[PDB]
Write a protein that binds this ligand. Structure first.
Ligand SMILES: O=C(O)CCCC[C@@H]1SC[C@@H]2NC(=O)N[C@@H]21
Ligand SMILES: O=C(O)CCCC[C@@H]1SC[C@@H]2NC(=O)N[C@@H]21
Ligand SMILES: O=C(O)CCCC[C@@H]1SC[C@@H]2NC(=O)N[C@@H]21
Ligand SMILES: O=C(O)CCCC[C@@H]1SC[C@@H]2NC(=O)N[C@@H]21
Lengths: 119, 120, 120, 119
């Protein structure tokens, strides 16, 4: 399932627990950017997905403040879990930095991450 | 400032509490889409923003399953809160539906929602 | 309807001609960013839209090189034209800067621009 | 360089010519979606890129109307060309469908395509 440790193509680490209620909790350690150590993540997933070979929709957020650094930014990942023996979480993400109003047009980066489950 | 009841340009209702250390917890009621009533949301926000006039970064997720319906999809909103006389949350969002691998290319809608505390 | 001079919420000026068979050709002058004066744009639009009240899909690209400056970046706008008494072009855009491979993760900004023919 | 034939992970075909003036022209054949045969594309690229090992920024548009079908939609790809012997064009894209105003919130799909040059 979703619960476990995952790594993406950048070398970031995603440790997550999926709760019976649809909750995602855990920590994220980013390999790049204005980040060090682990950050809290929270999110949600479809706890009763279709079983017709569709992925399980999910998303989560990290605000890039922990007890060692603050980037004044937040990323959300939106995507789907694809189960089986080579499980993947395939995502697109939005990274919004706090900006002044004049600079809001350049506040948000977009990208895509693929996570592979370890073990 | 983030804590409260917010409404976007579609008429959706976003009820949220900002916990002191960065949690966002609340409910979302979508006015459009395959949705009815309230859905659980969780997210995070910068609980110590910059003091230079910059907004407060945040994000949250809704999985579109509740006791009424399950759309087999999830939306994340990423944005910033802008305080002031008319506080606003300006976001972009990603709505991913569960799909087959083959159809993953058409799994994700993108858009932008603006929230204020002004009731329609 | 698409042909004309448009302005977005940032004050940028988008001057475009819609050719009969789907071409968009014009210039873009950005009011923000690493840009000055006009830049060439090209794009495409649906030259036979649906007749059910739907907007007209379109998109265009600017590479941010002209005789004045080169930002080593390019923006694409994807959206729809909505005709009517106050015609509008509603878009989302992707601004990709050239980066190293390692830094590609932070290469692309996303946003949304609304255009009308109303001069600021 | 950019001029040539490219294929992406979906099996789509991108035939492009890069002009000295920064123009991109060519045709696109989509392997998926509401599409058949070739469609016109136009775009732009940075004709004087940095040479410090950065990619070359570019973008292009296809409106999904040709003389055999009309999807009432348009895709833009924004990305960068990475030269060398295994040249790539790495993109993110936005596919906007014409909708009614009430349905505009669901008008736009986002994704990512990687193109590999043939030959
Ligand atoms: O630079 C910042 O504002 C904080 C760190 C951001 C890292 C981003 S989140 C999206 C992408 N995926 C990763 O694992 N790292 C980058
Ligand atoms: O149709 C679905 O899959 C679930 C409902 C989706 C509603 C979307 S979330 C983004 C946008 N903002 C809203 O308030 N509603 C729509
Ligand atoms: O800074 C750059 O790399 C070039 C100028 C970018 C301006 C961007 S394009 C998207 C948005 N809409 C505008 O009118 N201006 C900004
Ligand atoms: O379905 C449509 O509206 C027209 C065809 C869209 C195909 C899309 S464009 C983005 C992605 N990359 C491809 O090569 N095909 C899909």
């Amino acid at each position: 399932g979703i619960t476990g440790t995952w790594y993406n193509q950048l070398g970031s680490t995603f440790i997550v627990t999926a709760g019976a209620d649809g909750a995602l909790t855990g920590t994220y350690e980013a390999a790049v950017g204005n980040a060090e150590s682990r950050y809290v993540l929270t999110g949600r997933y479809d706890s009763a997905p279709a079983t017709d070979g569709s992925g399980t929709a999910l998303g989560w957020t990290v605000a890039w403040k922990n007890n060692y650094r603050n980037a004044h930014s937040a990323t959300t990942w939106s995507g789907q879990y694809v189960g089986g023996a080579e499980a993947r979480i395939n995502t697109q993400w939005l990274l919004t930095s706090g900006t002044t109003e004049a600079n809001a047009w350049k506040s948000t980066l977009v990208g895509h991450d693929t996570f592979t489950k370890v073990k």
